[PDB]
Amino acid sequence: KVFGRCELAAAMKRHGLDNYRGYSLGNWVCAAKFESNFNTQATNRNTDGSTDYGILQINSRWWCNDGRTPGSRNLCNIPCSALLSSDITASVNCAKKIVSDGNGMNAWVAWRNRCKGTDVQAWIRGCRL
Numbered sequence: 001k002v003f004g005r006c007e008l009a010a011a012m013k014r015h016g017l018d019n020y021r022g023y024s025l026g027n028w029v030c031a032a033k034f035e036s037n038f039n040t041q042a043t044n045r046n047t048d049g050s051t052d053y054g055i056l057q058i059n060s061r062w063w064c065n066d067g068r069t070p071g072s073r074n075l076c077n078i079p080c081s082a083l084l085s086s087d088i089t090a091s092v093n094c095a096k097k098i099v100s101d102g103n104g105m106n107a108w109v110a111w112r113n114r115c116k117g118t119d120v121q122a123w124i125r126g127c128r129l
């Protein structure tokens with residue numbers, strides 16, 4: 001499923017991401033825009049053989065099991081395909097674990113490079129929240 005911007009803002013807010021670990025909602029919407037273009041089905045291979053999955057591009061090197069990242073971890077204890085569903089629960093719950101691990105949103109390269117340091121509240125402008 002490809003979410004609209006305000007559609008995703010509402011879903012992320014209902015799932016408890018607004019102000020999670022101090023990151024306002026616009027941070028999460030911005031991250032999803034630039035990680036996946038709001039597309040739950042997005043997948044992208046990393047050069048180390050791992051793959052990023054879903055609307056927040058969560059990495060099989062550490063966070064989920066995709067059956068083809070030998071020796072990697074599965075910290076969210078899920079198949080990576082769970083991160084591709086139209087239901088964003090698994091992606092949100094795994095993102096909450098990632099952002100709590102000590103590095104915050106710096107885990108998301110697109111957030112670091114395209115959201116951090118910008119007016120991220122713009123990403124929820126015009127939305128009914």
Ligand code: NA
Nearest residue numbers: 049050051068
């Ligand atoms: Na992989």
Ligand code: NA
Nearest residue numbers: 060064072073
């Ligand atoms: Na893994």
Ligand code: NA
Nearest residue numbers: 057058107108
């Ligand atoms: Na990531």
